[PDB]
Write a protein of this length. Structure first.
Lengths: 49, 48
C-alpha cells in the first residue's frame, strides 16, 4: 500500500513487472454522511394495555 | 467478430459493501479471483 507500483507486484506475486497494464483493485467511494428521515409522528404507543 | 467486453467485481455483486458479508466470502478461497481472470482474459481476446 505504499504506491501503485507495489500494489501491482502484490497482485502478480513477483518483484519484476513486465511492460503492460494490470488490474489492481476497484475504485470504491466511501460515503461522507448519512441521511435519516422519519415521518412526523408524535404519539407514544399504548403498550401498557 | 467480437462481443461486448464486460467485467464483474465478484465481491461487490455478492456483498454490496457489507463487512459481515465480505469477511465470510474471504473463507471461500480464490473463487473470486478466478472469475475476474476469465472475464479479463475474454475481454482481451475480443480486441485480438
Amino acid at each position: 500500500a505504499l504506491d501503485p507500483l507495489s500494489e501491482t507486484k502484490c497482485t502478480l506475486k513477483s518483484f519484476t513487472v513486465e511492460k503492460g497494464i494490470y488490474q489492481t483493485s476497484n475504485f470504491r467511494v466511501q460515503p461522507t454522511e448519512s441521511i435519516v428521515r422519519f415521518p412526523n409522528i408524535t404519539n407514544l404507543c399504548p403498550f401498557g394495555e | 467478430v467480437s462481443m461486448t467486453k464486460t467485467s464483474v467485481d465478484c465481491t461487490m455483486y455478492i456483498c454490496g459493501d457489507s463487512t459481515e458479508c465480505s469477511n465470510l466470502l474471504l473463507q471461500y478461497g480464490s473463487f473470486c479471483t478466478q472469475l475476474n481472470r476469465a472475464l479479463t482474459g475474454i475481454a482481451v481476446e475480443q480486441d485480438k
